Amino acid sequence: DLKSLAKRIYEAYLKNFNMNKVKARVILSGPPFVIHDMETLCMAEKTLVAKLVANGIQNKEAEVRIFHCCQCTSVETVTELTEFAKAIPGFANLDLNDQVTLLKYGVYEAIFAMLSSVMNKDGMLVAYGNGFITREFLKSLRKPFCDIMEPKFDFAMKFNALELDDSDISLFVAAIICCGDRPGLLNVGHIEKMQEGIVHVLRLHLQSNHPDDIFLFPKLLQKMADLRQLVTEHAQLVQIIKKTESDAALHPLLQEIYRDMY
């Protein structure tokens, strides 16, 4: 049954992501440590990422230290997304090379969708729910580092106005991953059929869970397209950083994901 597909996907999302929207809102309502300036950045580093500045790289610029912490977080999130993908019914029956391709193109769209759950108009919850970085602090970083997060806050504020819950977001992330128009897929037809099943369950679930919003499904299709564009632009900025910033070397896994992408 399609209700079973939706529940299995939701259960896989609750199991595999450390942060979910209910948990994040519980914390964001009221005690995470607030990073809003350089003084509090340095304090947070000593409490929450002690090893990073035990010596250490703390003679590198603050923007570069933040970027490193962000890379570590993305490496962790790719692992969580991979375990979630492996639990999406039918994903494990795909060609292993197609599974790689789907993850490669889908992870950052899924990341920026899920980032919305930890953002409000003032900032974002970070470090496994233990810190909160203000949106204004991130805007205050030197270029180009101040240009990374702001488009993601802009996406998140509109996405959050749709008032989705984790049961919806889990299906939306599954739809993002199981996308038959990624470049290089071997078995496009089998992936399109899998995608169709997930999208069908998403359409029915939104009708049930959001009876008040008759356009919520096409709104979410548009958000998927917006996320693809957001990822293309993000990758372009990452390339500017990798090229102009010597201390901003990419973790090998992230280099692999970005290579030959867009």
Binding site: T82, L96, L103, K104, P252, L253, I257
Partner: peptide
């Protein structure tokens, strides 16, 4: 054996 594929095989 890419790192992504390694994660899938974990």
């Amino acid at each position: 054996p890419s790192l992504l594929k390694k994660l899938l095989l974990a």
